[PDB]
Structure formats: structure tokens, C-alpha cells
Amino acid sequence: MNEVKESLRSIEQKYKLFQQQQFTFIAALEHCRENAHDKIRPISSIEQVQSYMEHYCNNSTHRRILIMFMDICSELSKLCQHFEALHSGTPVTNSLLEKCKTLVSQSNDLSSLRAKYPHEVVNHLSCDEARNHYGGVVSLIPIVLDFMKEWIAHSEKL
Amino acid sequence: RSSRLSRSVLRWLQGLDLSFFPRNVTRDFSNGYLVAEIFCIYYPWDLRLSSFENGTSLKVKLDNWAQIEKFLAKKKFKLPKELIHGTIHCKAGVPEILIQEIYTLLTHQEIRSIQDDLANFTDYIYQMRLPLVPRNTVSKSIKNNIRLSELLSNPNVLSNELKIEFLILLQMLQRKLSRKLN
Amino acid sequence: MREIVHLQAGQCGNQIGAKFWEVISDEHGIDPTGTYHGDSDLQLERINVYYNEATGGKYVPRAVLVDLEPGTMDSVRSGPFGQIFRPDNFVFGQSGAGNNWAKGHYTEGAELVDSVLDVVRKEAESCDCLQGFQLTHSLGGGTGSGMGTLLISKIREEYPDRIMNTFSVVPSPKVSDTVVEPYNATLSVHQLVENTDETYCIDNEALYDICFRTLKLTTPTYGDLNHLVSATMSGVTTCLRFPGQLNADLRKLAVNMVPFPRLHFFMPGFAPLTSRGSQQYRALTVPELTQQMFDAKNMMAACDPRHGRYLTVAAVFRGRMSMKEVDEQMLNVQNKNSSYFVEWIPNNVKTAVCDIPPRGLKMSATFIGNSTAIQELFKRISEQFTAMFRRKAFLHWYTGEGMDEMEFTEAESNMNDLVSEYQQYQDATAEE
Amino acid sequence: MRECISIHVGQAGVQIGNACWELYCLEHGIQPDGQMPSDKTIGGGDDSFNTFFSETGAGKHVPRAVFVDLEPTVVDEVRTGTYRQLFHPEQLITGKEDAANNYARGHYTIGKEIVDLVLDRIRKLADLCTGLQGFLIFHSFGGGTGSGFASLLMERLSVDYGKKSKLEFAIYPAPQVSTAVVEPYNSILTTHTTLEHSDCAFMVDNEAIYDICRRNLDIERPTYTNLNRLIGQIVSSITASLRFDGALNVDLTEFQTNLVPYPRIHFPLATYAPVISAEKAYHEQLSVAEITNACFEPANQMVKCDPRHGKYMACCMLYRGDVVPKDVNAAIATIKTKRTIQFVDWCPTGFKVGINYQPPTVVPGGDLAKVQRAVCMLSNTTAIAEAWARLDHKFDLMYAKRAFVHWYVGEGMEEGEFSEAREDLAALEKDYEEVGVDS
Amino acid sequence: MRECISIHVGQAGVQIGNACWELYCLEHGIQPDGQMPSDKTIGGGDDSFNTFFSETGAGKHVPRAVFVDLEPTVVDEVRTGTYRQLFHPEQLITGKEDAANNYARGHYTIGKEIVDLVLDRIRKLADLCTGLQGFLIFHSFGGGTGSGFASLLMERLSVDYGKKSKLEFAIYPAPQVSTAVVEPYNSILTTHTTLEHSDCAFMVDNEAIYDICRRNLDIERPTYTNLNRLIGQIVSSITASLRFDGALNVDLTEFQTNLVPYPRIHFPLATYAPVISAEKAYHEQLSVAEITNACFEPANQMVKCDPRHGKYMACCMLYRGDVVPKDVNAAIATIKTKRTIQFVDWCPTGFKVGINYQPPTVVPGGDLAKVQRAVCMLSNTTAIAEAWARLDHKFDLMYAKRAFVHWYVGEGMEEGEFSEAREDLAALEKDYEEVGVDS
């Protein structure tokens, strides 16, 4: 049981590191979009992200932050699959697990996914970026972490 | 009954209509409220008694006395700064002398003063005149000549230690002399 | 309205004040939290005398604790009611007393007294009108005795139109606590007779003997004495706290109780001092209370009033009994016991009954008298001070602080004058 | 608040300080590691430990004491001990050369070399503290280190702090038994410094310890550990109201103010009670009256002197444990009427009442048993003046022909200092005689 | 309508402006995004926010303030904060070089370079507003950025707008403690400019803040955040009747007109009350008389000066929260008969009654508790002239030997200005004592 908690605290730590470098992350995203001639469609899918990191990337720190983010997504996926391997639980746990495995999809729409209080990932950027440039890429991990916390809280009272 | 103030000085001190008679000359005048009242009595258009508070605080004494020397500098009156400092820390024998000079400055009447300049600050002569040779310890002399008040006022370890060792040398020489007298 | 501001001094003063506060809180229905859990009627109207009105009806105490040692505040705050007082009032220094009056008045009474003056002035201004100030302390140390006189002098000089009552603890040659105790007592007596309205005599040895020979306690301690003095204080103050039929106040007593300002000492006392096994076997009546209130066994004095003559007497009752029995009892006492009070002044007893009974006990009454008995204590104090002064022992400590020795000379001259005055008023003859 | 700094000079001072610190750590549940590893079963320790120890940000305790010695052997002996992880090495200063029962070398040619270091150390220790009342200087008259270095340091300390109390605890050489020969040589010089430059001084000997242990504890082969334990018990009893509280707290200033009737007469007589073993504490009812009466017995006195020869001027009593005031009152009533006890026609009474709620504790492996209460007495009488008389007689008989003085001459010192010390001691004895004489 | 523009110069000015803006948004419920996202549970916001904010066509709020600083580090520090989405980047002008406690560079070689930009910015901001009454210039005397640039800007604002009120808010260099050394050098030049070209000036310090917080708030570890919170509370209390209304509205003009007795004497004494923590606001009954009496206590004064040294000429009193007129009248009747408070023999009375129905609010994470009512007083007295006296003494003892003057000489400026400032300050003082002298 403790292994999932250690994994979750590591996820939270790398998350905290990510927003500490969220500014550089957005700068790298803008550089990639300028180098890929795609400055119209907001980035709302992981697949676009690894497509940019693997094709339109020249700076080593940019690919470093992108591979750290991809590792973030992979760790979220591994925690989700460990949770699904643990047990079924109540239907609300099943729904939480399903929505989380959906949110960690490589090809999923994130254009209508935004974070709220107390998550300040939106407030760190301009409103325009959060609406139609980068709104789901930044407002994905905190919300998934909240669902993980809720799912663990529900499983613990079983 | 050893109020060191002269009969004439006391006869003029009573003659000023002070709010309260000083029962303890050393302590009451340490604040400076009484002397401020005296100066207001003599010079009403230059000092305001309302500006002075009758309290026992070191800070209040400092401020009252501060207004006092500001006034004195305005009036160009010559009074020793060491005398004022001793009065503030209510040193033995100092306030009586100070009141004597205040009387002489105001009334312009010369007094057959027993002692004008700095006197025997410590009680060495008094102790020698007493039988049963006292030979007070270093701590006793420190407490007699060094009080908590001036330590709070101005701290300087170097000068304090210089004065301490000077007084210790004086004590040792006087002890040698006393042993010679034996 | 008419409120009373309370003052604290001395570790024994602090403990007895805390005990009194706990006793009154219990009697008037105050929880240790700070709310009100009473079920009476008169415990809401005149409750603001010792409390102050606040939001949520959370009354706060009105007392300033003065001390030189931080080691008393922690002891009293840790009690069941130590979390209810005002921490701002706990004004304590950094250096201890060491049972010296002179230096505590000089060293620890210069830079610390400003805060207590400020807070008491703030408290006095906070109320509309006041009657006086109560300060409980002891003469056994430089904490109570060193600063109680100074603060009383300050408040008298500031507000002369107030009541200065105090309950200091007189020493005892048999039961001592300080080597230099007579010096401090002599120094305190001067200010007590010069700058104090009234003063009551408190002895620990007498309370000791009383509890042993009457209460028959297994292991009596200071807590019992604090309880007794608290009960005495409440019985004294119930005349204003709980109105009845014949109410009185501190000033009327002090005026009617004191023939001359130079002699303002009194003799307190409580009547029902019984053992545990005797509580269920007692007849509650007038003559029993009168007998316990007149005899020498129940007073709290380390002396004998039968050696002199009664000067002034006040009998404050607290219950629902009568008026006729008290006056007839005092009449027949003055008739029979004629060689015990001043014949020159008839009717030396004052009647006072509080219709409001105390909490927990149905019958209560206190004794406030001024009999000719403190003369022995005064003369023995004078003798022992003359002794410890002739060859000047334990004097270098006082000398090193700065103060001279003529203060002792004037104090002993005043004390000799006072004892001569007392002894020549003792034989108050009618004529030549 | 009530915090003090202890000074330990010489081998005796170091061992006494170690005993005091171990007694404090065992009585306060302070583990030798320096932290509180007691996470399973607690056994106390929730008290005011800031008087002697210090609290770190990591939950650690740092002793506040000075462990200095001219000879490094004692420092090495303590350093290889089991409590080496408690203190800090910076507080244990070693030395190349040592006095070893001499005053001249350790006062001029040895002690004067290490001055700035110890001054800086003690200044830092004082800065680490908020409230300072007095000091605990531990040394000995026999040890040349604890005499010369002690005197030279305490002179600077008293000139540097005139408002701080200066205590003294050392060993007085017994007239009957002794360890070395040059003991009075150093004693005559150290007494002048301790008299004309300090406020109070405590004299103790080892012969009385041996007598009391053989009479009560009934041991045929004593050891220094029992002596140090007795000294530590006395010290803890004296400073009992500082670490803890009680009905009537008695601070260092509180009893030191009355314990000194004259600046020249500040030499009290300490007496601990009950000094008993395990078997002497089971079938013996203990009250306050008996032990207070036994406190005045010469057999229980710490110094070999008959009280009946002189009389008392000032008396200071202390208590530790579950005591009831009525018993103290009864004891006072009993002793004030005893004709055997002599006193001046001048002080009808004088004493204190120190009530401490915390009972004295015990040590696993010691000889002291579990006692519900304790009592310590500090009296002032002129009957003890004979010890100085014997010391002066010995100094005179060994000074007429100048025995072992050429060494001091060669080291460099004034020969007239011997005469100065002799005349000062003679004047002190004359003053003690005058005070002991009534009208 | 009642709309004002705030000016923030230097790090202290910018941080004070940030504290004021965050206080305004929390008290009015303005969300950090700048919109009204509270669509589920409303928590307020239906008021006249036009005084400080501006309403767009899309439901957006734009702050109306000037955040200028010569050093870009403060601009970056604010820009990386959580409120970067609130203001606009064009209002935060960075800089290549900064004064940093220097007047000559920031007044001639540094400040003169950025003039047209800030003038265009303030002109646009004024054009965006309808009614203008006064300005809120926040700077400092120690900071060179807040002194030279502030002086050069206000000199031009004075000649460009004569019909508009010109306020002043900055920090006074305490004589006991200080941050830098050249503080008097910049202060002596800044006082002349603030005197001969402004209408009012507010002088505050930090030492008294430390004293009052340690005395009431009882914090062993203060921080600049509490200082900024106190200053922002003072500012909000002053401009309370502008954002809201009440029984007697007191506008900026309403109090500044009477707050200025003479063109040379425009230095009021600010004192906020109550200044207490959470535990200091629970078991303490709060009425108007007690706090009004406490407002005259020197311990609660922002400037360390004994009011008893001088006397009052003009006084401006304000209130905020549920206050009853009878309590105000009783307090006035009490203080008018108080002998301790001194006043001139020509002004028997003078004061204002500002009733505000809206009580002051609290902040999540701050120290201020929930108080039903507040009070602020602005009095004029001669007892504060000692600060100018001490400053003149320090400048004189610094200028005799020309310490650190060669730098200003090399930068390019007239040396006679120091004499000009000294004589102007001497004349201003002399006027102050002449006014303080009654008949």
C-alpha cells in the first residue's frame, strides 16, 4: 500500500518542479510552435507535444523539460494501471480511474480542460495563452493529482 | 539630620512656593521637576512647567534635564556637565552642591561654601575616620561608585575598566598606608 | 459605575490573591473558561465590581500582578484559573528580590514601576468612577513590602480621594522567614503609618494554631491559610458586593473604625471555625456566633487583646437572622465585660448584617475590631530593631545600595513615638 | 532567566563537574547521546532544563560549563569516557606544561599563557545566555593549577563583572591527613585572593567525608566517586529552587544576600543530610526535626570543628523533598530553646524556608538510597576560625627557615607576598575573634 | 467622479502599492484574474469600484497606478508574482541604471532620461479618468530612486497641474537605526523640494513600527509584510469615504483644506488604531473613548516624539466601522478637558467627524483580526520639529569635512545647494518655533 503513496509523493515533487519551470516550458513550447509553423491551433494533446519534442527541437534544455514532462505522463499512466491492478472498488473509484486514464491519453482533447483554485497554473500565464494557446497542457497534471488524492481517500475508507 | 544644603539655601528653597517640599534632596531633585519649577518661577516667559512631567523614569529624567540644559544654553548659564550627570544619577552630595550653585547664580549671593570643586567622591575618608578598619571590598566600591543607572545610560567597557583598575590601585595604596599606620 | 481596582504584590500576596479570585469565581458561578455558569440573582447586577463587561459576556478580572521574579507567574498561570487573567498585568522583572527592601525600592523600583503606573492609570480611566484600591501583599520580602508602599504612595499622590486598604502580613519572632525581617518591617511601618488609609494585621502562626487546635487538620498548608484569608476578604467585601438590608462600605468603616489616622490597624476574624466531624453537630444561633466572635481563641492574632481595652468594634453578619439579638448581645457584653473596652466612649460595636447568605454556607459573619493588642508586637519589634541596630549588623548590604543610615534612626524614633502614643491612650482615663 | 556558568579548574574541578553533569542528566532523564531517543516509554524530562542545558533547533542539549586544565592527562581521561558525545571538544582546553601543586609557575609562567582563549570562551558562553546570576568555580587549594590559574582567572572575572555573584568551591587541606607537602604554601596565597576579591567561599575537607562514610555508610575501602557524589548532591540541593519551583523559592541571590554578614566574613559551614546508605534508609523513620537536629551535630559537620567553642551569627537552611511546614515550625521551636546550641546575644533568629516539591532522586550503582526529603544547612560561626589558626601556625613554622622557597624565588615572585598574606590572615583572625566576642 | 491616480517610485513604493492593491481587491472581492468568475456563490462586489478600478466592456478591471523603478529587479520580482495577469506590463517601466541611494545620478544623469515616457503614461491615465482630485505618490527618502526621480517628476507635475492636490508618502530615516549612510544627504535635498513645491507631506518611520508590533502584536520575528499591511490599512482608512459613503463623508479636499494651517507647516502626525493581533482582539472590550485616548499616547505614535514637548494647532480625526455619534461626543468632551494634552491658546477646538458604515476587513494570512470599528487621527504639532533638528545636526557634522561629497561633485551639481538646503531647513524650523510660541 505504501508504494503507491511513495509514487504519488514523487509525482507531486516532480509536479512542483514542473511549475517552478513552467515559464521555461511555455517558452520552449512557443519556440517549437514558431519552428513548426503552427501558431494557430492550441496545444491540447500530448501527441502534439512528443511530435514537437522529437521533430521541432534544437535546444537541449527544451528537450530536457519535454522528456521530463513525458516521464510525468508515463508515471501518471503507471500509477493508474497499478491502481486498476489493485482492485475494482466502488463505481465512483471506477469512474475516477476511467477519467484519469482518459486524461493521460496521448491523443485526447484538452482544449476545454482548465484548472481552478487553488491551482495557480492558469494565473501564471496570460489569459489568452490559457484559452487558445496552452490551456490543457498546463491544466492537466494538477487535476489528475486531485483525482488521485480523491480516489485514494475513497479507497481508504473501504 | 545631615541635609548638606546651607541654611540660606534652604531658606530660599522654601521661598519659591514649590508644589511639594523635597523630603529627600538627593532623590527628589534627580528628576529635575523641582529645578524646572524654580526656573519657571524666576523666568516664566521662557520655560513651561507643563512641558515637564514629575516621574521616576530614567528617560523622563533625561528629557527633563535635556530641556534644562537647552534653556541654560539659551540663558548662557555656566553649570558643570559632570555636576548635572551626578545629579541625574542621584550621586551622594551632588544635588546639594548643584542647588547651592543654582542659588548663587539666581540670587547673586555668595555663600561660605564648605567645598566648591569635586569633593571626595567615595567614602574613603569617612571609613578611615571610623574605627574597626572597614577595608571595603572591590565589589562594595564598585556598587558605591558605579550604579545601574549610568551603566544603562552610557556603556563603555574600556573606560569602565580603566576607572575600576584606577580605583583598585587607589584602594591598594590606601591599604598599604593604613597598614603603615598600624 | 462604583468599581474596585485590585492590586497584587509579593509571592504570598500573589498566591492569596489567586486563591481569593478562585473563591469568588466559584461563589458567583464563573467557570474556569471565562463564561458565566451561575444560577443566582444578585450575581449579575453588581458583578461588574470586580469584573469588566466584554463581548459574549466574558467577564475579565481587574487586578495587576507586580513581581520581581518570573518564577511566580508560571506557578499561578498553571493553576485551574490561571488562564483567565490578563497576561499584560503580569509585570515581572529579570532580577530577584532576595529579601531586601532598600535595593528593591531603588534598583528594581525605578525602571519597572513605570509600566505598572501606566496600566493602573489605564484601568482607572477605563471605568467611570472608583472608590479605592485593594492591594494584598506581605512584609516577608522585598517584593510585597519593597513596592507596595511605593505604589500606594504613588496612587495616593495621584488620586488622594480613594480608599487605601491593605492586608499585609505582620512577622512573628517565633515563626520567621527572613534574617533581615525586622529591618524591612520597620521600614514598611513608616510608610504604613504615613501614606496609608487603613491596614489589617495578618499572621501565619495564629492561623496555624487555630487550624490545629480547632479545625484539627491532618496536613494543613499555605493553601488553607489562603482559603481562610479569602473567606475573610469576601465576608468583608460582601457589604458592597451583595446588598442586604443594612449595607455598608469600606469608607464608612474606615471613618467610623479609626479614631486617629496614626492608628489605622485592625483585627480581622471569622466565627465558624469547626472541625470536619463537628460540621454535622452544631446549633446555628446568635449567642454562639457572638461567643466565637468575642473570645480570644478564634481570633487570628499572635497576642492577647485581654491585656488592653477595646477601642472600636464592627460586627458584619452575612445571613438571614435578626436585628434585636445582636444589639441585646452587645448591650449585655458591654454591661458584663466592662473592664475590656473604653468606658469614655459608649457603644463601641457597629451592627452590620448582610441579607445575602454566602454560597455553600448558610451562616457566616466576620469580625473587624481594633483592640489594644498590637502594642506587644510593636514593642517587641522596637526592641529587636534597637538590638539589630546598635552594633549595626547586616547593614553593609543596605549601605552599598546608596541609602544612608539616618532612615533607620527616623524610623525607630517614629516607632518609639507610636508605641508611647499607643500605651498612653491605652489607659484612657475619664478625668484626673 | 535563572542561568549560570560553571567553572572547573584542576583534576578535582573537572571530576566534580563531570559528577554534577551526570547527576543532572540522570535526574532530568537527559540521555548521554544528547537527544531524546525515548520514543517508546517516557520516563520524565518535561521540565525547565534551560537553567543548565540549552535547547537547539534539532532537539539537542549543550552543557554550559568550563573544563580547563593545565595537564592534558585529565582531558584525555575524560575524552575517552562514555559521555564524550555530550559536550564539545572546544570546552576542554589542554596544555603543554602543568602546575601540579605550585603557585608560582601556574600563576606567572604557565597560566598567563592561556588567557585570551578562556576569556573568549567564557564571553561566548555568556553571550549564549540571557540571564546571569552567579558562577560555579570548581578548583582546589592543594592543586597548583586550581590555585594559581583559578586566582588569576577569577581576578579578571571579578574586574570584568562587578554585578555578578562570584561563588567558590574547593578543598581545604585537613590538618591531620594530607596529600602533598606544599599545600599550605599555595593555600596562604589563594586565601588572600579568595578573601579580598570574592564574595563567598565554601571550604570542605576529605577527613570529614571519610569519617561520615565509615560511621554511616560503613565502608572499609572508600573511593573518590563517593566523595564526588556527596559534593554533587550538596551542589544540587543548594541550587534546587533554580531548576524547579516550590512553595518558597530561594534563588542564589536570595540566600547569598543574607549569608554574608560582613565582607570579610563570608565563610559558611555546609552540612548535608541525610548522608546514609541503602540499609541505613529502610528501617529508620525519617522526620524533619531529627535531621535538623542532626544537622548541628559536629559528627555530621563537613569541617572538623567543635561548634560549641564559638557561636552562630547567621544561619541558612534549605530543604528538598516532600516536607510539611508544621514540622519545620516545630523544629525551629525546638532548636531556639536548646541550650547546647550557642548563639550571639544579638541575633534572636535568622533563617530561610526553601520548600522544593521535587524529591531527590537516586542513581543505579550508587550508595545513596531513596529518601523522601533532604535538608542542607549553611551556618556562620566563629568556631571554625581554628583552621586558619592552624594554617598560620604551619606557615610560620615552615617559613622561619624558608623551606622550599628558593624554587618560588627562582621562578620569579616577591618574597614579601608571604609576609603580606601572613599579616592579612592575622588581621582576619583578629576580626573573627572580635566578632565572636559579645558585649 | 472621485478618482485618483497612484504613483509608486522605488522598491518601497512599489511594494506599498502592491500591498494597497491586494488589500483593495480582497476587501472588494476583486478576483486576481480581473473578472467576476464567482457565478455559483457570490461574496460581494456590488459597490462603487470606479474610484480605484476601471470597468471595461468585457467586465474587466484595470488598475490605475504608476509602477516605475530605475532598477529592473523589482519589476521582475513583481512580474513573476501571482497578480501578473491583473495590471498591464506597459505600466511597469524598467531601467538600465538605478540610483540606489544616490541623488545626483537619479536626478541628472539617470532620471532625466526617462521623462517623456512616464509623462505620456500619466497623461493617458488622466485622460482615461473623468474626475481628478489628488495623487498618491509613494516613494522614500532613503532610496535614491524614490528621491531624485520623485523630486524631478513632482516638480513638473506641480507646474502642469496647479488645481490638483499633491500628496506625499515616504519613509523617514530613524536616528537610532538606519539602513544606509547617505540617507541624510538625499533627505536634505528632498525635504526642500517637498516643502517648496508640494502641499502636504506624510513622514513615517520603521523603528516605531517595530516598537508597536513587539509591544502589542508580540512578534519576535517581524517582517516588511506587516509594515506594508499597516501602511495600506492607514491609506485605506484615510481614503475610506471615497470608495464608500457614510453619515458624514470626508473627501480628500475636505480634510486637506483644514489639514494645512500654513504653506510651510504641512507635516501631520498619523496614528492608526487599533493596532492589535488576533488574541489582542478577543477578550478586550473596544469602545471609542478608550481608543481615542490611546491615539494620543506617544507609544502608539508613528513618529517617535513626545507630544508634551509641544502643543497642537490643527487635528484631523477619522473613523471607519460601526461607530456611534454619542461615543464620539463623549470622547471629545473627555479630551477637551484633559490637562495632559497641550494646545495653543488660540484654537479651542478643531476636528472632523467621518462616519463610515463599512467596517474594515481582514486578510487570510495576515495578523489583523476582525474589529468592529477603526479610527485614524491626523494632528499638527510643533513637538515633531526635533526630527528636522536632528537631521540638520547630522548634516552639519557630515558637511564640515565634506564626507562622500566628491562623488556628487563629479556627477555634476552645485555645492551651494547644500548651504541652500541647510538655510531653508533652518528658516523652516525657526518658523516652526515661532508658531509654537504663544503670546
UniProtKB/Swiss-Prot annotation, chain A:
Keyword Cytoplasm set for record: yes
InterPro entries for the chain: SPACA9
Tissue: Expressed in sperm (at protein level). Expressed from almost all the cell types of testis, with abundant expression in round and elongated spermatids (at protein level). Predominantly expressed in tissues containing motile cilia.
Site (Essential for interaction with INCA1): Y117, H119
Keyword flag Cytoplasm: yes
Pfam families: SPACA9
Swiss-Prot/TrEMBL induction comment: Expression is activated by FOXJ1 and NOTO.
Main location: cytoplasm
One GO term of the biological process aspect: axoneme assembly
Consequence of gene disruption: Deficient mice are viable, fertile, and have no clear phenotypic differences from wild-type mice.
Keywords carried by this UniProt record: Cell projection, Cilium, Cytoplasm, Cytoplasmic vesicle, Cytoskeleton, Flagellum, Nucleus
Function recorded in the entry: Microtubule inner protein (MIP) part of the dynein-decorated doublet microtubules (DMTs) of multiciliated respiratory cells and the distal singlet microtubules of monoflagellated spermatozoa. Forms an extensive interaction network cross-linking the lumen of axonemal doublet microtubules.
Protein name, UniProt field: Sperm acrosome-associated protein 9
Organism: Mus musculus (Mouse)
Curated annotation (Swiss-Prot), chain B:
GO cellular component: cytoplasm; cytosol; nucleoplasm
Tissue-by-tissue expression: Testis.
Subcellular localization: Nucleus
Signal peptide: none
All copies of domain Calponin-homology (CH), residue ranges: 3-109
Keyword Nucleus listed: yes
Keyword Ligase: no
Keyword tags: Nucleus
Function, in words: May play a role in apoptosis regulation.
Protein name: Spermatogenesis-associated protein 4
Protein's organism: Mus musculus (Mouse)
From-to range in the entire protein, with total length: 46 to 227 of 295
Curated annotation (Swiss-Prot), chain C:
Tissue: Widely expressed. Expressed in the retina and the cochlea.
Protein residues bound to GTP: Q11, E69, S138, G142, T143, G144, N204, N226
Pfam families, alphabetized: Tubulin (PF00091), Tubulin_C (PF03953)
Disulfide bridge partners, by residue number: none
Cofactor: Mg(2+)
Protein's cellular compartments: Cytoplasm, Cytoskeleton; Cytoplasm, Cytoskeleton, Flagellum axoneme
Sequence positions bearing Phosphothreonine: T55
Modified residues (Phosphoserine): S172
Chief localization: cytoplasm
Keywords tagged on the record: Acetylation, Cell projection, Cilium, Cytoplasm, Cytoskeleton, Flagellum, GTP-binding, Isopeptide bond, Magnesium, Metal-binding, Microtubule, Nucleotide-binding, Phosphoprotein
Domain notes: The highly acidic C-terminal region may bind cations such as calcium.
Name of protein: Tubulin beta-4B chain
Organism: Mus musculus
Taxonomic placement: Eukaryota, Metazoa, Chordata, Craniata, Vertebrata
From Swiss-Prot, chains D, E:
Cofactor(s), names only, from the UniProt record: Mg(2+)
Catalytic residues (positions): E254
Modified positions (Phosphotyrosine) in chain numbering: Y432
Record PTM Phosphoserine, positions in chain: S48, S439
3'-nitrotyrosine modifications at: Y83
Gene3D superfamilies: Helix hairpin bin (1.10.287.600), Tubulin/FtsZ, C-terminal domain (3.30.1330.20), Tubulin/FtsZ, GTPase domain (3.40.50.1440)
MREC motif (motif): residue ranges: 1-4
Pfam families on file: Tubulin (PF00091), Tubulin_C (PF03953)
Residue sites binding Mg(2+) per the record: E71
Annotated compartments: Cytoplasm, Cytoskeleton; Cytoplasm, Cytoskeleton, Flagellum axoneme
Task of the protein: Tubulin is the major constituent of microtubules, a cylinder consisting of laterally associated linear protofilaments composed of alpha- and beta-tubulin heterodimers. Microtubules grow by the addition of GTP-tubulin dimers to the microtubule end, where a stabilizing cap forms. Below the cap, tubulin dimers are in GDP-bound state, owing to GTPase activity of alpha-tubulin.
Protein name per its UniProtKB record: Tubulin alpha-3 chain
